[PDB]
Amino acid sequence: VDCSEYPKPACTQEYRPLCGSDNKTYGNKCNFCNAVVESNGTLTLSHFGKC
């Protein structure tokens, strides 16, 4: 996962979780990538799957 093309005004809502560097489980790549932007590039991917 590369979030360059983010942000996105909306995300579909299927569930395929990713684990963020904030120990938060992000429900999908779109959700995660929008959070990276919102973090101003400080949030990163820990691993794929639930935290």
Binding site: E5, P9, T12, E14, Y15, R16
Partner: protein, 185 residues
């Protein structure tokens, strides 16, 4: 299994929108972004209870898909959680609506606009969507949007979350019923 319950495909989890049928054949509706590239569907994470196989999928442009039940025994309630659904109807601005999804459960709100275009990026653009101020979170895709005993739509996507508030766009259910020639029961 009923509207709002979890559905699992090879790729991830979505939610069942509505149970429908044509003649003696039973199917279920869900989001097309969920049925896209999915074949088989199961009722649990374990993939041990088979529900059926994808019969149609319309995404992007629209956002509806339909799965044909292959499981004979599983009960097929024409409900949404235990709420009976007896008809389908068109959405209207200021209409009070309710959504149920497998991740967040049931949340309510209003229809704020019609015919919205939603750009999910990468060429994935959907049109003719119902905008509402109801929140939705990952796993809630394809769940029902209803009003009373009226089927209204299928969760497609949006932004924000249930804690702070958000915006969710739904696919009008009528359009899906019409395309497949099925009906709510």
């Amino acid at each position: 299994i009923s509207g709002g319950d979890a559905i699992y495909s090879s790729t991830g989890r979505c939610s069942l929108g509505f149970n429908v049928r044509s003649g003696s054949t039973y199917y279920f509706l869900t989001a097309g972004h969920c049925t896209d590239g999915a074949t088989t569907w199961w009722a649990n994470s374990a993939r041990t209870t088979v529900l059926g196989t994808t019969s149609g999928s319309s995404f992007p442009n629209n956002d509806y898909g339909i799965v044909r039940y292959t499981n004979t025994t599983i009960p097929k309630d024409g409900t949404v959680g235990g709420q009976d659904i007896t008809s389908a109807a068109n959405a209207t601005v200021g209409m009070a609506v309710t959504r149920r999804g497998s991740t967040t459960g049931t949340h309510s709100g209003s229809v704020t606009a019609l015919n919205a275009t939603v750009n999910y990026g990468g060429g994935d653009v959907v049109y003719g969507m119902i905008r509402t101020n109801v929140c939705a979170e990952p796993g809630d895709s394809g769940g029902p949007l209803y009003s009373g005993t009226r089927a209204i739509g299928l969760t497609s996507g949006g932004s924000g979350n249930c804690s702070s508030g958000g915006t969710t766009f739904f696919q009008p259910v009528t359009e899906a019923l019409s395309a497949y020639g099925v009906s709510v029961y």
